[PDB]
Amino acid sequence: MLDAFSRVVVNSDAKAAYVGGSDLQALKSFIADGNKRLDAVNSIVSNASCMVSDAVSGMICENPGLISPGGNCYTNRRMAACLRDGEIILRYVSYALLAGDASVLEDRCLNGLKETYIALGVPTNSSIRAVSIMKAQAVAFITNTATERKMSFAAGDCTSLASEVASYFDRVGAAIS
Amino acid sequence: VKLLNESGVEKLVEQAGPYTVFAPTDDAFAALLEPHSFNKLATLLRPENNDALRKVLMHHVIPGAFTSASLMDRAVTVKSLAGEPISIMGLNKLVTAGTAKVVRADVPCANGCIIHAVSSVIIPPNYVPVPQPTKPVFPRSVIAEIAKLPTPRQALGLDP
Amino acid sequence: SLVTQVILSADDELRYPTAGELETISSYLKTGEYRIRLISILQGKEQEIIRLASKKIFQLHPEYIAPGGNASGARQRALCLRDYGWYLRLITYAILAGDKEPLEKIGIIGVREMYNSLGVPIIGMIDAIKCLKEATVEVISQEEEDFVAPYYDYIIQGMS
Amino acid sequence: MQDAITSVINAADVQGKYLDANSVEKLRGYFQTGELRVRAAATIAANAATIIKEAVAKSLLYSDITRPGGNMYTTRRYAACIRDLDYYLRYATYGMLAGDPSILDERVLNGLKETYNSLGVPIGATIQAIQAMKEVTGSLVGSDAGKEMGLYFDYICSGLS
Amino acid sequence: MQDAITSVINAADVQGKYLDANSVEKLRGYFQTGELRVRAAATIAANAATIIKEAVAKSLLYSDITRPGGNMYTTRRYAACIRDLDYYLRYATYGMLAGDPSILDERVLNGLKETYNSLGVPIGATIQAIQAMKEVTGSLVGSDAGKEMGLYFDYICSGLS
Amino acid sequence: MKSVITTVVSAADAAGRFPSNSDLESIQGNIQRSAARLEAAEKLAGNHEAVVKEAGDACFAKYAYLKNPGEAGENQEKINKCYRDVDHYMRLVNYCLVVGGTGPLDEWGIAGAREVYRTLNLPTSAYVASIAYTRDRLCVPRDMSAQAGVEFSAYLDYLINALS
Amino acid sequence: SIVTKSIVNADAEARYLSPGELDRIKSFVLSGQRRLRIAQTLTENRERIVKQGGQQLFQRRPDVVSPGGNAYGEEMTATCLRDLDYYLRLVTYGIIAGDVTPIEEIGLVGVKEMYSALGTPISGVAEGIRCMKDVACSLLSGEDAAEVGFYFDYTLAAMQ
Amino acid sequence: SIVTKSIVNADAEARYLSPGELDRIKSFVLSGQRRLRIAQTLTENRERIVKQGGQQLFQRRPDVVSPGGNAYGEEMTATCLRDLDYYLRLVTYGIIAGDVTPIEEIGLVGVKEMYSALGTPISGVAEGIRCMKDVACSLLSGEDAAEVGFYFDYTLAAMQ
Amino acid sequence: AYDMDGTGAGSLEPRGIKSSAVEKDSRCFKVTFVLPSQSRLYTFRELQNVYTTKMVPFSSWYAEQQRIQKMGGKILKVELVAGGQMRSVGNQ
Amino acid sequence: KAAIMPHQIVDGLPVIPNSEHPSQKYNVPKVSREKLQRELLIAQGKANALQIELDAAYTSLASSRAFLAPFAAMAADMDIRPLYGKNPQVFAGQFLGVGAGQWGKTGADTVRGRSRRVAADIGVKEFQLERVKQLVVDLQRALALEDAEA
Amino acid sequence: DVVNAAYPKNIKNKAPVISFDGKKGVKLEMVTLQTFAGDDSEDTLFDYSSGKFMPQKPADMGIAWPSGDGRQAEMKGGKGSFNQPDLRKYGPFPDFLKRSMDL
């Protein structure tokens, strides 16, 4: 995998260029906003058990045919195998937000995920809904606009980190369409 | 004009040298579906055989400005820009260029060049059709080939 | 413009622009917007200025306004302000492209034969431009009017 | 033969308009790039022979136009090339300073493709020489300056095609 | 403008190969007739005015192009003919020495039939004049030399047609 | 690509774990030490044609036998590929100061190097004399700071310890 | 200089000097204080600019100084540096004249005839001036190094 | 050749060929038997005339083959001998054409532009042709060596 | 002789039109162009037709074609009427 | 009997950071399955022209070496001694290495030769064939999912 | 429009293709049976071009030269203050010459 630092290296290795002064300044600004990012990913991994229960119950709360006999989340064993698909998608986003890159999302999390979902008989559109509920939850903790849990932070604004973690959940839903 | 543009021959007949092109109308190209002529020309439809397509097209360019009026009962040959001789024959008000049987008399062009419309496509004389793409075959055994070579004792009649 | 004079003047010698010429382009482009800021000042004062030009060109020359003169009549005087408008419009071009060619490729080259075939006294038009330069000083401060002063008297030098 | 200022004046001038604020965006835009173009034209003047030597060695002295029968065989014919490539690198420098490709078709493009067909000069190898010459020119003047100088090279290649 | 040696060298050079046995085989054939061509060009230089006087009197002297209205009526127009026929007998002499008709179309044939149509010069009477001029030229230089000099006359007549 | 981030993401992904407090604490050391190694990365990116020319002919002034016929400096293409390799190695040290770990020297410069230099008959002691020339001409107040010298020299003898 | 060829330009055209020509003679003479400072730096740095100039020249072109090179021995190497002292002097003239007109008619016009007729590699002397340029621009700030280097590379261009 | 430019000389002068021109075309074609023998000697001695030609060239100009020379390495040295094979070929053309007209428009016209634009020392290639001349004239008698050497030194003259 | 002796930049004769014409070249074009004078309005000379079609030699077509655009001319058509193409020897 | 399609091997391989041609596996748009064949056949067609386009370039490299092979072997037994160079008690100068940036991005771009240059030409073909042996893979392979998820 | 949620990803399976192989059973098959397609759309998902690429020329401006003077056809901004009208109008011309306004 790569991170935010070795994405600049593999883009300059294609040109045989040293890492100069212009793209060092975009990396020097990554480190200066580094305490925001560790404050950001601490917000999501502290609330991660409530998020995967708010997600896949609300997917069932909109789609009540998934628990009918002949549904994907019908029995008790298949419900735990959707709860396990909540917290792996949420885990690999949490690595991608911590790294500053979407390498670990691409070659591990989405690698072969659609081809598995065809062969099992997973509903395609219902996985787009439960990921986007977790997109609605993740920006609610980065912007601290959650309804029943408030977390204390320093004074400032982190609207750029909430947009970066929103683009990671759209990349999950774009791969399993 | 399309075969010229693809084959790169069109740069050659761009030049200012006085040429006498025998460009066949596409009914001539449409008449390439002979059972006979399709043998020796269909292989050029393959996309790697641009090699022969330039000579076969370069056989239609004649250095010089031979108008039909200049062929009053005269039989003169010449080689193309492909490199092999072609016999232009004009007798009894009907002109010929190999197997052409020219349709339209002349078209005046830019650099003193002439354009005659022919009824067929002239294939060069010593043009062999390219073989179809085949299988590189290798001998399965090695003992079926030592047995295929005559020994010295066989060549002198010492053995059967 | 000024870069065009350097590209042309360097092109007839078949060479790139030298060290001094590239100064002349570089210094001209660094004074860029100040011409741009200046022309917007003058465009907002074109109705300002030509009204003042008609003040003194006619109190100086009532021969043209009187019955018999060229400018006698309404429609003759109507375009009379139009010629001021085109000249003032031309000077905004000359103030921008920092040289005389827009005042010379238009307006100056062959202006006498234009007026002489029109009946406008060519000496009167010289005072008209001199009147126009006299009018531009009032609606313009001392800083920038000597920036625009050499563009006016070139026209007077061109008309003689 | 118009630069960016001449073309802006003219469109102001053929219709008879004054210089309105929207028209000046390119100009307030041309004067901003005035510093970049001179330094671009500076280094190109210095490395004129080096750029042409790099282009021909990288594009066509590697294909049988250089050998006998090819379009560039005799020394008079070879010497005509670097003379010929010098104009493309030179007139492109003029377009880069003037900011307008009017000088190219005025003095280079007109009667050019009609002339190479007369001589029998291969237009295909010519454009690739200019493309390779465009590639080395982006090396010297940088990226954006190469984008500017490169914008007039393919203008020559387009019209010469 | 190539002679037999220039054309042989060009074709042998255009393939980038040396002068093999076939290229020198034609060159030896040209050197064998080198003695014949000079004596042919010798007598033609001597009897230049006599040959042209014989051709016009034998082909188009008394025809009605010579009379009023014909294409050759006025003295300026008549004088242009013998000036014009002098080039055909002269340039044909050059082709006979060079052994290659490249000089004819280079300097005579191109724009020739397109010029006579402009002036309204009759191409029909022009070719016989050259045919009659070819007939007298075979008288002077002999049979085979007339075959050589005659081989370039009809080349003019063919292209001029 | 061994960075601080990929050595703690792959540790947490192996046990099936969310990023906990030991993972975030190590990224705070990536913040606190980047000021020392990006100062050496910007001195290397702005001076590299003079430091690989000086180290490149430390090889050729020491080992004059390479210019011999059959030997390893014989024509000009072979000398130009020698200075290319010092320029490849000093670019990979510069990539390692950016990422904060030995990853670009690992997968792009060191893995497979002893098989290539043995097959093509290239003396790997002539590579080491180029790298140890650069490691011993570093003046720690003149050329960078003090703790930028200990990040520059640490990746330099990671390369000497792996090439020989 | 810029003053003499801005005159002879407008001299040939039968006209006076435009604002484009007179706002640059004006702009050049106010630049004259800064030019003498730049030429004053190169004036008493010729000991280092020349000697370090020939420093890199021999390290980059050992052929010219090796036995068989044109500048071989104690004699030619002294003259080998003499020419660099010449061309360094002409650059001081071009900086004060604001143009390569002094460098043009001295050391540039017909320079290839001299060095070809002396057996000197003209490309080698071009390498010498480039080595002097890096030493010269290393002695001045960025605003000045865009000028002092600017005249060297013109000499590099005309010297090949 | 002597035949083609004795024609184009008398062509321009509006006249036929004099005895001075026709007694030399005559004298040249009787010389043609002896010319082909001379060119036949150089034709299949190119292996020695070129390889020994580059023999003395490197012994006299080790700079061009030393590291930094233009013909350095296995690659350029092969092309280093390729040009000598070219110029040795053109001398065979000039001997059979009886003039340097083939050598003129091939390898001589604009030759300094090519070699200057290739970075090759034009004086070095002139030294190569002189080394070939001593090998060539050593292969022929005195009557022939006054010709075969005669065309080389013309190439030496035009190549500097 | 020919125009490519070795002259280029920095050479004694002034930098000028250099044509790739051989010794006594015999190639010539047939060109067509209009060339407005752009100088009659301050010289007031008599007027001459500017649309010309003429045979220029190969030895000096490039100079003429380089000059016809110098004064704003437009070249409508040019051809190589006399001469060969790719011809090593024989242009003389 | 059935050959394994090359997109099914790309799913099995672990992912590298640097490709020459990074994949459009996620960047193919959701068009109708017909449209991922009107873009995959084209990739094979476009790629196979480069493969035969690397064939007229290879015949020009073989013709360029035969052009110079009488002189390449004729200069192979000459004595070419330089003026500076190969040993340490003489001068050289820069040439004991090379000077100041003039080694190039590769090393073969300096090192001139007729043979060599076409060879550096091949990169603007064989690397450019690269990427294309690669646009018909994810047109097929996304295609493979489509005819598997159907 | 994609209105076929009636047709899922089991459209063209063609269930009734039936092969008897004699008097025994009907051997039912669901082979997809694609058409003589070709999917006629332009500007597909990738570029597919090595460079060999300088194809771009400007459009013809008539008699003048291209882009040299499209000056009659320009957006423009301001007119002036006095500006007498034309009153004969003589056709809109078209191109101006090998020429420009800056003569």
Ligand SMILES: *C(=C)C1=C(C)[C@@H](Cc2[nH]c(/C=C3N=C(/C=C4\NC(=O)[C@H](C)[C@H]4CC)C(C)=C\3CCC(=O)O)c(CCC(=O)O)c2C)NC1=O
């Ligand atoms: C049906 C019975 C049913 C639903 C439908 C679904 C409603 C729903 N809720 C959200 C959004 C959130 N859930 C969140 C998780 C938590 N909120 C908390 O306060 C605690 C800390 C935590 C649980 C441990 C959060 C943070 C959100 C975001 C907004 C909010 O604060 O409410 C959605 C997503 C909106 C979308 O579709 O985009 C839906 C549909 N839950 C049900 O039980």
Ligand SMILES: *[C@H](C)[C@H]1/C(=C/C2=NC(=C\c3[nH]c(C[C@H]4NC(=O)C(C=C)=C4C)c(C)c3CCC(=O)O)/C(CCC(=O)O)=C2C)NC(=O)[C@@H]1C
């Ligand atoms: C279709 C109506 C036939 C049939 C066709 C197949 N042909 C296949 C391969 C093939 N065909 C040819 C001949 C063709 N190609 C040419 O280039 C030329 C002209 C020169 C012709 C006439 C060749 C040479 C080959 C390749 C030979 C080989 O590799 O075996 C083929 C298999 C490949 C594919 O489908 O793309 C088929 C199906 N076969 C049939 O059964 C029907 C009746």
Ligand SMILES: *[C@H](C)[C@H]1/C(=C/C2=NC(=C\c3[nH]c(C[C@H]4NC(=O)C(C=C)=C4C)c(C)c3CCC(=O)O)/C(CCC(=O)O)=C2C)NC(=O)[C@@H]1C
């Ligand atoms: C100079 C100190 C040596 C020397 C250098 C040569 N290396 C040659 C080939 C070679 N080297 C490498 C490793 C290099 N390439 C990389 O990509 C990286 C790291 C990013 C490094 C360090 C490779 C992969 C290769 C082969 C490919 C190539 O040609 O670049 C080499 C050519 C081998 C030959 O021609 O014999 C040389 C000359 N070797 C020497 O001869 C001196 C001592």
Ligand SMILES: *[C@H](C)[C@H]1/C(=C/C2=NC(=C\c3[nH]c(C[C@H]4NC(=O)C(C=C)=C4C)c(C)c3CCC(=O)O)/C(CCC(=O)O)=C2C)NC(=O)[C@@H]1C
């Ligand atoms: C009506 C569409 C036809 C027709 C149908 C009849 N078929 C009769 C007998 C018969 N048919 C078959 C073939 C069919 N039976 C099978 O088991 C299978 C597959 C394994 C197939 C395709 C067989 C084998 C037989 C038996 C023949 C025999 O006895 O040897 C039939 C006779 C009455 C009956 O058996 O139901 C009829 C009327 N015949 C027609 O004339 C129309 C056109």
Ligand SMILES: C=CC1=C(C)[C@@H](Cc2[nH]c(/C=C3N=C(/C=C4\NC(=O)[C@H](C)[C@H]4CC)C(C)=C\3CCC(=O)O)c(CCC(=O)O)c2C)NC1=O
């Ligand atoms: C070991 C793990 C670890 C952490 C969890 C963080 C903890 C942390 N975050 C911040 C510091 C901060 N944290 C935020 C973050 C936020 N403010 C908001 O309004 C948003 C709601 C929210 C995150 C999304 C901001 C804006 C700052 C100040 C920026 C800064 O100090 O750089 C600081 C202060 C840094 C300083 O003093 O300079 C610290 C210690 N750092 C760590 O090393």
Ligand SMILES: CCC1=C(C)/C(=C/C2=NC(=C\c3[nH]c(/C=C4\NC(=O)[C@H](C)[C@H]4CC)c(C)c3CCC(=O)O)/C(CCC(=O)O)=C2C)NC1=O
């Ligand atoms: C862009 C440069 C330019 C100019 C200047 C120009 C002038 C011009 N002035 C004209 C007429 C005229 N111009 C005048 C002018 C004047 N009477 C006075 O007393 C004054 C001093 C002077 C005006 C300030 C008069 C009286 C006529 C009408 C003469 C007639 O038709 O009887 C006419 C005939 C048509 C018309 O009015 O438009 C032209 C073309 N054309 C150009 O292209």
Ligand SMILES: CCC1=C(C)/C(=C/C2=NC(=C\c3[nH]c(/C=C4\NC(=O)[C@H](C)[C@H]4CC)c(C)c3CCC(=O)O)/C(CCC(=O)O)=C2C)NC1=O
């Ligand atoms: C102001 C413009 C100007 C210049 C440039 C100039 C040059 C000049 N250079 C000369 C010689 C020379 N010049 C060199 C030069 C060189 N050798 C090398 O290897 C290097 C490549 C190069 C120097 C960097 C040598 C070796 C000689 C002596 C040649 C001989 O003795 O034959 C001479 C003859 C001796 C003399 O009078 O000095 C002149 C006139 N004169 C001028 O008026």
Ligand SMILES: CCC1=C(C)/C(=C/C2=NC(=C\c3[nH]c(/C=C4\NC(=O)[C@H](C)[C@H]4CC)c(C)c3CCC(=O)O)/C(CCC(=O)O)=C2C)NC1=O
């Ligand atoms: C028939 C007339 C004629 C000539 C003479 C000719 C020369 C010619 N010489 C070339 C290269 C070359 N020529 C040399 C020559 C030399 N190096 C030395 O040290 C010596 C002084 C000298 C040879 C004696 C070298 C080294 C190259 C390759 C230069 C490079 O790769 O950059 C090339 C480019 C590659 C090629 O296409 O061969 C041409 C066209 N072409 C012609 O049509």
Ligand SMILES: CCC1=C(C)/C(=C/C2=NC(=C\c3[nH]c(/C=C4\NC(=O)[C@H](C)[C@H]4CC)c(C)c3CCC(=O)O)/C(CCC(=O)O)=C2C)NC1=O
């Ligand atoms: C300023 C605008 C402008 C251009 C561009 C121009 C071109 C021009 N190129 C010419 C020839 C030529 N041009 C080439 C060029 C080439 N051969 C190749 O293989 C390459 C593809 C190409 C080099 C890139 C050659 C070989 C000739 C000589 C043709 C001959 O002798 O028949 C000639 C004939 C006369 C002469 O060179 O003296 C002209 C006029 N004239 C102009 O006014």
